[PDB]
Protein backbone atom coordinates (compact mmCIF):
# COMPACT_ATOMS: atom_id res chain seq x y z
CA UNK A 1 0.00 0.00 0.00
CA UNK A 2 0.94 3.69 -0.16
CA UNK A 3 1.63 5.54 3.10
CA UNK A 4 1.79 9.32 3.72
CA UNK A 5 5.18 10.94 4.35
CA UNK A 6 4.35 11.67 8.00
CA UNK A 7 3.89 7.94 8.68
CA UNK A 8 6.52 6.76 6.22
CA UNK A 9 9.24 8.50 8.24
CA UNK A 10 8.86 6.00 11.09
CA UNK A 11 10.20 3.13 8.96
CA UNK A 12 13.59 4.88 8.74
CA UNK A 13 14.96 4.40 12.25
CA UNK A 14 18.34 5.14 13.80
CA UNK A 15 21.12 2.69 12.97
CA UNK A 16 22.21 -0.03 15.38
CA UNK A 17 25.56 1.56 16.23
CA UNK A 18 24.22 5.04 17.00
CA UNK A 19 21.24 3.64 18.91
CA UNK A 20 23.55 1.47 21.03
CA UNK A 21 25.67 4.53 21.82
CA UNK A 22 22.54 6.56 22.56
CA UNK A 23 21.34 4.07 25.16
CA UNK A 24 24.75 4.07 26.85
CA UNK A 25 24.12 7.70 27.78
CA UNK A 26 20.46 7.05 28.58
CA UNK A 27 21.30 4.21 30.97
CA UNK A 28 23.43 6.60 33.04
CA UNK A 29 20.34 8.75 33.66
CA UNK A 30 17.67 6.20 34.46
CA UNK A 31 15.09 7.34 37.02
CA UNK A 32 15.46 5.70 40.40
CA UNK A 33 13.27 2.65 40.92
CA UNK A 34 10.29 2.53 43.26
CA UNK A 35 12.51 0.57 45.65
CA UNK A 36 15.47 2.94 45.42
CA UNK A 37 13.18 5.93 45.92
CA UNK A 38 11.70 4.35 49.05
CA UNK A 39 15.16 3.57 50.43
CA UNK A 40 16.30 7.17 49.94
CA UNK A 41 13.16 8.59 51.54
CA UNK A 42 13.16 6.28 54.57
CA UNK A 43 16.85 7.11 55.09
CA UNK A 44 15.93 10.79 55.34
CA UNK A 45 12.98 9.83 57.55
CA UNK A 46 15.26 8.37 60.23
CA UNK A 47 17.41 11.50 60.06
CA UNK A 48 14.19 13.38 60.86
CA UNK A 49 12.70 11.00 63.43
CA UNK A 50 15.89 11.08 65.51
CA UNK A 51 17.40 14.44 64.58
CA UNK A 52 19.29 16.16 61.77
CA UNK A 53 20.35 20.75 51.43
CA UNK A 54 21.00 18.59 48.37
CA UNK A 55 21.52 18.98 44.62
CA UNK A 56 18.99 18.86 41.81
CA UNK A 57 18.43 15.27 40.62
CA UNK A 58 19.44 14.02 37.19
CA UNK A 59 17.33 11.64 35.13
CA UNK A 60 15.88 11.04 31.69
CA UNK A 61 12.49 12.60 30.96
CA UNK A 62 9.59 10.37 29.95
CA UNK A 63 5.89 10.67 29.27
CA UNK A 64 4.22 11.95 26.12
CA UNK A 65 2.56 15.02 27.66
CA UNK A 66 5.69 15.76 29.68
CA UNK A 67 8.11 15.49 26.76
CA UNK A 68 5.96 17.51 24.33
CA UNK A 69 5.78 20.28 26.93
CA UNK A 70 9.58 20.16 27.26
CA UNK A 71 10.06 20.47 23.50
CA UNK A 72 7.67 23.42 23.34
CA UNK A 73 9.68 24.99 26.16
CA UNK A 74 12.90 24.21 24.23
CA UNK A 75 14.15 22.39 27.34
CA UNK A 76 14.94 19.13 25.52
CA UNK A 77 18.37 18.53 23.99
CA UNK A 78 17.57 15.10 22.52
CA UNK A 79 14.21 13.46 21.84
CA UNK A 80 14.01 9.74 21.05
CA UNK A 81 10.71 8.62 19.53
CA UNK A 82 9.53 5.02 19.56
CA UNK A 83 9.03 3.56 16.10
CA UNK A 84 6.05 1.29 16.85
CA UNK A 85 3.50 3.27 18.86
CA UNK A 86 0.25 1.33 18.53
CA UNK A 87 -1.83 4.36 17.50
CA UNK A 88 0.74 6.05 15.28
CA UNK A 89 -0.96 9.44 15.54
CA UNK A 90 0.34 9.72 19.12
CA UNK A 91 3.86 10.56 17.92
CA UNK A 92 3.17 11.39 14.27
CA UNK A 93 3.61 15.12 15.01
CA UNK A 94 6.72 14.78 17.18
CA UNK A 95 9.29 14.85 14.32
CA UNK A 96 7.60 17.98 12.97
CA UNK A 97 7.37 19.63 16.39
CA UNK A 98 11.04 18.79 16.99
CA UNK A 99 11.94 20.29 13.61
CA UNK A 100 10.01 23.48 14.42
CA UNK A 101 11.63 23.88 17.84
CA UNK A 102 15.15 22.97 16.71
CA UNK A 103 15.33 19.89 18.94
CA UNK A 104 17.73 17.11 17.83
CA UNK A 105 15.50 14.07 17.52
CA UNK A 106 15.76 10.45 16.43
CA UNK A 107 13.37 7.57 15.83
CA UNK A 108 14.68 4.53 17.67
CA UNK A 109 13.50 0.92 17.59
CA UNK A 110 11.60 -1.11 20.18
CA UNK A 111 9.47 1.18 22.35
CA UNK A 112 10.07 -1.61 24.88
CA UNK A 113 13.76 -0.65 24.94
CA UNK A 114 12.74 2.91 25.80
CA UNK A 115 10.55 1.63 28.63
CA UNK A 116 13.37 -0.46 30.08
CA UNK A 117 15.43 2.70 30.65
CA UNK A 118 12.66 4.14 32.83
CA UNK A 119 11.74 0.86 34.59
CA UNK A 120 8.45 0.69 32.67
CA UNK A 121 6.99 -1.85 30.29
CA UNK A 122 6.67 0.74 27.54
CA UNK A 123 7.57 4.33 26.71
CA UNK A 124 6.38 6.23 23.65
CA UNK A 125 9.14 8.86 23.79
CA UNK A 126 12.22 9.62 25.88
CA UNK A 127 13.84 13.04 26.21
CA UNK A 128 17.20 14.09 27.63
CA UNK A 129 16.84 17.65 28.90
CA UNK A 130 20.06 18.45 30.78
CA UNK A 131 22.86 16.17 31.95
CA UNK A 132 25.82 16.41 34.30
CA UNK A 133 28.97 18.31 33.37
CA UNK A 134 30.85 15.01 32.98
CA UNK A 135 28.55 13.89 30.16
CA UNK A 136 28.39 17.18 28.23
CA UNK A 137 30.85 15.88 25.63
CA UNK A 138 29.17 12.47 25.44
CA UNK A 139 25.76 14.05 24.79
CA UNK A 140 27.31 16.55 22.37
CA UNK A 141 28.92 13.73 20.38
CA UNK A 142 25.61 11.85 20.30
CA UNK A 143 23.74 14.94 19.06
CA UNK A 144 26.31 15.33 16.28
CA UNK A 145 25.91 11.65 15.40
CA UNK A 146 22.11 11.95 15.32
CA UNK A 147 22.52 14.94 13.00
CA UNK A 148 24.58 12.90 10.53
CA UNK A 149 23.17 9.39 10.91
CA UNK A 150 19.51 10.45 11.11
CA UNK A 151 19.00 14.07 10.01
CA UNK A 152 21.62 14.27 7.26
CA UNK A 153 20.67 10.74 6.25
CA UNK A 154 17.10 10.15 5.09
CA UNK A 155 15.66 13.69 5.17
CA UNK A 156 14.99 13.66 1.43
CA UNK A 157 13.48 10.20 1.98
CA UNK A 158 11.14 11.39 4.75
CA UNK A 159 9.30 13.71 2.34
CA UNK A 160 8.34 10.85 -0.01
CA UNK A 161 5.28 8.63 0.23
CA UNK A 162 6.52 5.21 1.32
CA UNK A 163 5.23 1.77 0.52
CA UNK A 164 3.66 0.64 -2.72
Amino acid sequence: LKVPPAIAQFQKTLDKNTATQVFKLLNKYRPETAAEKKQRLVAEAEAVANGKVSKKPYNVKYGLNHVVALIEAKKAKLVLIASDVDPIELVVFLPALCKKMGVPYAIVKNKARLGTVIHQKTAAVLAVTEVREEDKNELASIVSAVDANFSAKYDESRRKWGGG
Binding site: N27, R30, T33, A35, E36, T116, H119
Partner: protein, 362 residues
Amino acid sequence: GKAGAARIYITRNQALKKLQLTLADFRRICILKGVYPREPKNKKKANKVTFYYTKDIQYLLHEPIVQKFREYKVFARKLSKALGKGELETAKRLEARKPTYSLDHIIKERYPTFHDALKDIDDALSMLFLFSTMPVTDKIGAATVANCERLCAEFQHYVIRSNSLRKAFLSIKGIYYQAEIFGEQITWIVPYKFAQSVPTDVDFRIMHTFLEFYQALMGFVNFKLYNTLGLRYPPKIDVAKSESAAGLAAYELEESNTSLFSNFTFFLSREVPRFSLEFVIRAFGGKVGWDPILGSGSPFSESDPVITHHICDRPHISQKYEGRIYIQPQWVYDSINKGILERTDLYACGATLPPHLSPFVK
Protein backbone atom coordinates in the same frame (compact mmCIF):
# COMPACT_ATOMS: atom_id res chain seq x y z
CA GLY B 1 -10.68 -51.90 30.12
CA LYS B 2 -11.91 -49.05 32.30
CA ALA B 3 -11.90 -51.09 35.52
CA GLY B 4 -9.95 -53.80 37.30
CA ALA B 5 -6.21 -54.21 36.72
CA ALA B 6 -6.20 -51.30 34.25
CA ARG B 7 -7.27 -48.91 37.01
CA ILE B 8 -5.03 -50.73 39.51
CA TYR B 9 -1.84 -49.29 37.99
CA ILE B 10 -1.18 -45.86 36.50
CA THR B 11 1.31 -45.35 33.68
CA ARG B 12 4.16 -42.87 34.06
CA ASN B 13 2.58 -40.51 31.53
CA GLN B 14 -0.85 -41.04 33.08
CA ALA B 15 0.48 -40.47 36.60
CA LEU B 16 2.29 -37.31 35.47
CA LYS B 17 -0.86 -36.10 33.70
CA LYS B 18 -2.96 -36.66 36.84
CA LEU B 19 -0.39 -34.86 39.01
CA GLN B 20 0.19 -32.15 36.35
CA LEU B 21 3.95 -32.31 36.97
CA THR B 22 6.92 -32.63 34.65
CA LEU B 23 9.04 -35.78 34.43
CA ALA B 24 11.93 -34.16 36.30
CA ASP B 25 9.59 -32.80 38.98
CA PHE B 26 7.85 -36.17 39.32
CA ARG B 27 11.21 -37.92 39.72
CA ARG B 28 12.26 -35.42 42.39
CA ILE B 29 8.96 -35.87 44.23
CA CYS B 30 9.22 -39.66 44.00
CA ILE B 31 12.81 -39.59 45.28
CA LEU B 32 12.05 -37.12 48.09
CA LYS B 33 8.87 -38.91 49.18
CA GLY B 34 8.11 -42.64 49.27
CA VAL B 35 7.11 -43.87 45.82
CA TYR B 36 8.36 -46.89 43.88
CA PRO B 37 7.20 -48.59 40.67
CA ARG B 38 4.72 -51.43 41.18
CA GLU B 39 4.47 -53.93 38.33
CA PRO B 40 0.97 -55.47 38.23
CA LYS B 41 0.50 -59.22 38.02
CA ASN B 42 -1.36 -58.85 34.70
CA LYS B 43 0.67 -56.33 32.71
CA LYS B 44 -1.59 -56.65 29.66
CA LYS B 45 -4.71 -56.08 31.77
CA ALA B 46 -3.04 -53.19 33.63
CA ASN B 47 -2.45 -51.39 30.31
CA LYS B 48 -6.09 -51.85 29.18
CA VAL B 49 5.71 -49.31 30.69
CA THR B 50 6.21 -48.20 34.29
CA PHE B 51 3.25 -48.85 36.58
CA TYR B 52 2.40 -47.14 39.87
CA TYR B 53 -0.47 -47.55 42.31
CA THR B 54 -3.24 -44.96 42.07
CA LYS B 55 -3.13 -44.51 45.85
CA ASP B 56 0.37 -43.04 45.63
CA ILE B 57 -0.69 -40.75 42.78
CA GLN B 58 -3.79 -39.70 44.73
CA TYR B 59 -1.65 -38.82 47.76
CA LEU B 60 0.89 -36.98 45.59
CA LEU B 61 -1.84 -34.75 44.12
CA HIS B 62 -2.01 -32.67 47.32
CA GLU B 63 1.73 -32.92 48.02
CA PRO B 64 3.25 -29.44 48.52
CA ILE B 65 6.46 -30.47 46.71
CA VAL B 66 4.95 -29.72 43.29
CA GLN B 67 3.63 -26.35 44.48
CA LYS B 68 7.02 -25.49 46.00
CA PHE B 69 8.76 -26.53 42.77
CA ARG B 70 6.52 -24.19 40.76
CA GLU B 71 7.23 -21.35 43.19
CA TYR B 72 10.98 -21.90 42.80
CA LYS B 73 10.61 -21.99 39.01
CA VAL B 74 8.34 -18.93 39.02
CA PHE B 75 10.73 -17.01 41.28
CA ALA B 76 13.69 -18.06 39.12
CA ARG B 77 11.98 -16.60 36.05
CA LYS B 78 11.35 -13.33 37.91
CA LEU B 79 15.01 -13.22 38.99
CA SER B 80 16.01 -13.72 35.35
CA LYS B 81 13.61 -10.93 34.36
CA ALA B 82 15.25 -8.45 36.74
CA LEU B 83 18.76 -9.27 35.48
CA GLY B 84 17.76 -8.73 31.85
CA LYS B 85 15.99 -5.44 32.55
CA GLY B 86 19.19 -4.17 34.19
CA GLU B 87 17.96 -3.52 37.76
CA LEU B 88 20.58 -5.47 39.69
CA GLU B 89 19.22 -4.39 43.09
CA THR B 90 15.84 -6.03 42.45
CA ALA B 91 17.47 -9.35 41.55
CA LYS B 92 19.85 -9.20 44.52
CA ARG B 93 17.02 -8.44 46.95
CA LEU B 94 14.77 -11.12 45.43
CA GLU B 95 17.60 -13.65 45.80
CA ALA B 96 17.45 -13.44 49.60
CA ARG B 97 13.66 -13.92 49.61
CA LYS B 98 13.81 -16.94 47.29
CA PRO B 99 11.50 -19.87 48.07
CA THR B 100 12.62 -22.89 50.07
CA TYR B 101 11.15 -26.20 51.23
CA SER B 102 10.86 -28.36 54.34
CA LEU B 103 11.17 -32.15 54.52
CA ASP B 104 9.79 -32.57 58.06
CA HIS B 105 6.36 -33.63 56.80
CA ILE B 106 7.86 -36.03 54.24
CA ILE B 107 10.20 -37.57 56.82
CA LYS B 108 7.33 -38.09 59.28
CA GLU B 109 5.14 -39.62 56.56
CA ARG B 110 7.93 -41.87 55.26
CA TYR B 111 9.24 -42.69 58.76
CA PRO B 112 6.50 -42.40 61.40
CA THR B 113 8.92 -43.70 64.05
CA PHE B 114 12.62 -43.08 64.60
CA HIS B 115 13.25 -46.84 64.38
CA ASP B 116 12.15 -46.92 60.73
CA ALA B 117 14.34 -43.91 59.91
CA LEU B 118 17.34 -45.45 61.69
CA LYS B 119 16.90 -48.76 59.84
CA ASP B 120 16.68 -46.88 56.52
CA ILE B 121 19.61 -44.57 57.34
CA ASP B 122 22.21 -47.07 56.10
CA ASP B 123 21.90 -45.73 52.55
CA ALA B 124 21.83 -42.15 53.85
CA LEU B 125 25.03 -42.67 55.87
CA SER B 126 26.78 -44.26 52.88
CA MET B 127 25.69 -41.42 50.57
CA LEU B 128 26.83 -38.78 53.08
CA PHE B 129 30.20 -40.48 53.56
CA LEU B 130 30.73 -40.83 49.80
CA PHE B 131 29.85 -37.17 49.20
CA SER B 132 31.99 -36.00 52.14
CA THR B 133 35.20 -36.53 50.12
CA MET B 134 33.99 -35.85 46.58
CA PRO B 135 35.44 -32.71 44.96
CA VAL B 136 33.24 -29.65 44.60
CA THR B 137 31.73 -29.39 41.11
CA ASP B 138 29.12 -27.24 39.37
CA LYS B 139 26.46 -29.95 39.65
CA ILE B 140 27.13 -30.48 43.37
CA GLY B 141 26.73 -27.79 46.03
CA ALA B 142 29.67 -26.54 48.08
CA ALA B 143 27.37 -25.76 51.01
CA THR B 144 25.69 -29.15 50.60
CA VAL B 145 29.09 -30.87 50.63
CA ALA B 146 30.04 -28.96 53.79
CA ASN B 147 26.70 -29.85 55.39
CA CYS B 148 27.15 -33.52 54.48
CA GLU B 149 30.68 -33.51 55.92
CA ARG B 150 29.43 -31.82 59.09
CA LEU B 151 26.58 -34.33 59.38
CA CYS B 152 29.00 -37.23 58.92
CA ALA B 153 31.35 -35.77 61.53
CA GLU B 154 28.47 -35.29 63.97
CA PHE B 155 27.30 -38.87 63.41
CA GLN B 156 30.83 -40.19 63.96
CA HIS B 157 31.19 -38.14 67.15
CA TYR B 158 27.83 -39.37 68.45
CA VAL B 159 28.73 -42.98 67.63
CA ILE B 160 32.14 -42.60 69.31
CA ARG B 161 30.60 -41.04 72.43
CA SER B 162 27.90 -43.74 72.63
CA ASN B 163 30.31 -46.54 71.58
CA SER B 164 27.64 -47.80 69.17
CA LEU B 165 30.18 -49.09 66.63
CA ARG B 166 30.41 -52.88 66.54
CA LYS B 167 32.38 -54.00 63.46
CA ALA B 168 34.88 -52.33 61.14
CA PHE B 169 36.06 -53.94 57.89
CA LEU B 170 38.62 -52.69 55.36
CA SER B 171 37.34 -53.28 51.82
CA ILE B 172 38.69 -52.35 48.40
CA LYS B 173 35.94 -49.76 47.87
CA GLY B 174 36.46 -48.29 51.34
CA ILE B 175 35.87 -48.83 55.06
CA TYR B 176 32.65 -50.59 56.09
CA TYR B 177 31.47 -49.72 59.61
CA GLN B 178 28.62 -51.58 61.33
CA ALA B 179 26.99 -49.95 64.35
CA GLU B 180 23.96 -50.70 66.53
CA ILE B 181 21.87 -47.66 67.50
CA PHE B 182 18.61 -48.18 69.43
CA GLY B 183 18.73 -51.87 68.52
CA GLU B 184 18.71 -51.13 64.80
CA GLN B 185 21.84 -52.04 62.82
CA ILE B 186 23.25 -49.33 60.54
CA THR B 187 25.97 -50.06 57.98
CA TRP B 188 27.95 -47.27 56.31
CA ILE B 189 30.76 -47.26 53.74
CA VAL B 190 33.43 -44.55 53.92
CA PRO B 191 35.41 -44.25 50.66
CA TYR B 192 39.15 -43.74 50.92
CA LYS B 193 40.70 -40.32 50.31
CA PHE B 194 42.03 -40.73 46.77
CA ALA B 195 42.37 -38.55 43.66
CA GLN B 196 39.19 -39.82 42.03
CA SER B 197 37.43 -38.38 38.99
CA VAL B 198 33.80 -37.79 38.04
CA PRO B 199 32.51 -40.71 35.92
CA THR B 200 30.28 -38.27 33.97
CA ASP B 201 27.77 -41.09 33.43
CA VAL B 202 25.21 -40.90 36.27
CA ASP B 203 22.45 -38.32 36.66
CA PHE B 204 23.63 -35.49 38.92
CA ARG B 205 20.15 -34.09 39.56
CA ILE B 206 18.86 -37.41 40.89
CA MET B 207 21.97 -37.93 43.03
CA HIS B 208 21.76 -34.41 44.45
CA THR B 209 18.08 -34.88 45.32
CA PHE B 210 18.87 -38.20 47.01
CA LEU B 211 21.79 -36.61 48.87
CA GLU B 212 19.58 -33.72 50.02
CA PHE B 213 16.96 -36.16 51.33
CA TYR B 214 19.70 -38.26 52.95
CA GLN B 215 21.21 -35.18 54.60
CA ALA B 216 17.82 -34.12 55.98
CA LEU B 217 17.21 -37.61 57.37
CA MET B 218 20.72 -37.71 58.85
CA GLY B 219 20.25 -34.29 60.44
CA PHE B 220 16.92 -35.28 61.99
CA VAL B 221 18.42 -38.54 63.27
CA ASN B 222 21.43 -36.70 64.71
CA PHE B 223 19.19 -34.18 66.48
CA LYS B 224 17.06 -36.97 67.97
CA LEU B 225 20.16 -38.92 69.04
CA TYR B 226 21.74 -35.81 70.57
CA ASN B 227 18.54 -35.00 72.48
CA THR B 228 18.26 -38.59 73.74
CA LEU B 229 21.92 -38.64 74.82
CA GLY B 230 21.84 -35.05 76.09
CA LEU B 231 24.24 -33.74 73.44
CA ARG B 232 23.69 -30.31 71.92
CA TYR B 233 22.20 -30.40 68.41
CA PRO B 234 24.01 -29.12 66.41
CA PRO B 235 27.33 -29.62 68.21
CA LYS B 236 29.70 -26.68 68.47
CA ILE B 237 32.27 -26.47 65.66
CA ASP B 238 35.57 -24.60 65.86
CA VAL B 239 36.35 -22.54 62.75
CA ALA B 240 40.10 -22.46 63.47
CA LYS B 241 40.23 -26.23 64.02
CA SER B 242 38.20 -26.85 60.85
CA GLU B 243 40.64 -24.77 58.79
CA SER B 244 43.49 -26.81 60.33
CA ALA B 245 42.00 -30.17 59.23
CA ALA B 246 41.40 -31.22 62.84
CA GLY B 247 38.60 -33.57 61.76
CA LEU B 248 36.29 -34.51 64.62
CA ALA B 249 38.27 -32.30 67.03
CA ALA B 250 36.54 -29.20 65.64
CA TYR B 251 33.08 -30.64 66.39
CA GLU B 252 32.86 -30.39 70.18
CA LEU B 253 30.35 -32.79 71.75
CA GLU B 254 28.99 -30.27 74.22
CA GLU B 255 26.28 -31.55 76.56
CA SER B 256 22.91 -29.80 76.50
CA ASN B 257 33.85 -54.79 73.40
CA THR B 258 33.32 -51.10 74.20
CA SER B 259 36.71 -50.93 75.98
CA LEU B 260 38.86 -53.20 73.82
CA PHE B 261 41.51 -50.49 73.31
CA SER B 262 40.58 -48.24 76.24
CA ASN B 263 43.96 -48.79 77.93
CA PHE B 264 45.94 -47.90 74.82
CA THR B 265 47.26 -44.69 73.23
CA PHE B 266 47.38 -45.33 69.49
CA PHE B 267 49.51 -43.03 67.34
CA LEU B 268 49.28 -42.62 63.56
CA SER B 269 51.83 -41.16 61.15
CA ARG B 270 51.30 -39.60 57.71
CA GLU B 271 51.14 -42.94 55.89
CA VAL B 272 47.73 -44.44 56.77
CA PRO B 273 44.09 -43.35 56.55
CA ARG B 274 43.87 -41.82 60.03
CA PHE B 275 40.36 -40.52 59.29
CA SER B 276 38.87 -43.98 59.82
CA LEU B 277 41.46 -45.15 62.36
CA GLU B 278 40.73 -42.24 64.71
CA PHE B 279 36.98 -42.85 64.50
CA VAL B 280 37.44 -46.56 65.26
CA ILE B 281 39.74 -45.78 68.20
CA ARG B 282 37.35 -43.12 69.49
CA ALA B 283 34.42 -45.54 69.17
CA PHE B 284 36.45 -48.06 71.19
CA GLY B 285 37.05 -45.53 73.97
CA GLY B 286 40.80 -45.33 73.37
CA LYS B 287 43.05 -42.38 72.60
CA VAL B 288 44.12 -41.75 69.00
CA GLY B 289 46.98 -39.46 68.00
CA TRP B 290 47.86 -38.14 64.56
CA ASP B 291 50.94 -36.55 63.03
CA PRO B 292 51.00 -32.79 62.38
CA ILE B 293 50.95 -33.43 58.63
CA LEU B 294 47.71 -35.41 58.92
CA GLY B 295 46.10 -32.65 60.99
CA SER B 296 46.34 -30.26 63.89
CA GLY B 297 44.97 -30.47 67.42
CA SER B 298 46.69 -33.78 68.15
CA PRO B 299 46.67 -34.46 71.92
CA PHE B 300 49.93 -36.44 71.64
CA SER B 301 53.14 -35.99 69.66
CA GLU B 302 55.50 -38.36 67.88
CA SER B 303 58.27 -37.77 70.44
CA ASP B 304 55.88 -38.58 73.30
CA PRO B 305 56.71 -42.05 74.70
CA VAL B 306 53.23 -42.49 76.21
CA ILE B 307 51.97 -44.06 72.97
CA THR B 308 51.78 -47.83 73.36
CA HIS B 309 51.10 -48.66 69.69
CA HIS B 310 52.28 -46.61 66.70
CA ILE B 311 50.21 -47.18 63.55
CA CYS B 312 52.37 -46.77 60.45
CA ASP B 313 51.95 -48.45 57.06
CA ARG B 314 55.43 -47.40 55.91
CA PRO B 315 57.97 -50.25 55.57
CA HIS B 316 60.78 -48.25 57.22
CA ILE B 317 60.84 -46.42 60.57
CA SER B 318 64.09 -44.48 60.99
CA GLN B 319 62.90 -42.73 64.18
CA LYS B 320 61.34 -45.76 65.88
CA TYR B 321 61.18 -45.34 69.65
CA GLU B 322 60.85 -47.72 72.62
CA GLY B 323 57.45 -48.74 73.94
CA ARG B 324 55.78 -47.67 70.66
CA ILE B 325 56.29 -50.76 68.50
CA TYR B 326 54.85 -50.30 65.02
CA ILE B 327 51.48 -51.91 64.29
CA GLN B 328 49.39 -52.21 61.16
CA PRO B 329 45.81 -51.00 60.59
CA GLN B 330 44.80 -54.58 59.71
CA TRP B 331 45.36 -55.67 63.32
CA VAL B 332 43.29 -52.74 64.60
CA TYR B 333 40.52 -53.52 62.11
CA ASP B 334 40.64 -57.21 63.03
CA SER B 335 40.64 -56.36 66.75
CA ILE B 336 37.63 -54.05 66.37
CA ASN B 337 35.67 -56.61 64.33
CA LYS B 338 36.51 -59.53 66.65
CA GLY B 339 36.47 -57.57 69.91
CA ILE B 340 39.83 -59.02 71.01
CA LEU B 341 43.24 -57.38 70.66
CA GLU B 342 45.33 -58.88 67.86
CA ARG B 343 49.05 -59.70 67.82
CA THR B 344 51.14 -56.58 67.24
CA ASP B 345 54.17 -58.69 66.29
CA LEU B 346 52.23 -60.46 63.53
CA TYR B 347 51.13 -57.11 62.06
CA ALA B 348 54.44 -55.36 62.73
CA CYS B 349 56.05 -53.07 60.17
CA GLY B 350 57.82 -54.96 57.40
CA ALA B 351 55.87 -58.17 58.06
CA THR B 352 53.29 -60.03 56.01
CA LEU B 353 49.79 -58.62 56.44
CA PRO B 354 47.33 -61.25 57.74
CA PRO B 355 44.18 -61.70 55.64
CA HIS B 356 41.31 -59.40 56.59
CA LEU B 357 38.12 -61.34 57.29
CA SER B 358 34.90 -59.46 56.56
CA PRO B 359 32.80 -59.16 59.75
CA PHE B 360 29.60 -58.96 57.68
CA VAL B 361 30.38 -62.33 56.06
CA LYS B 362 29.01 -65.21 58.13
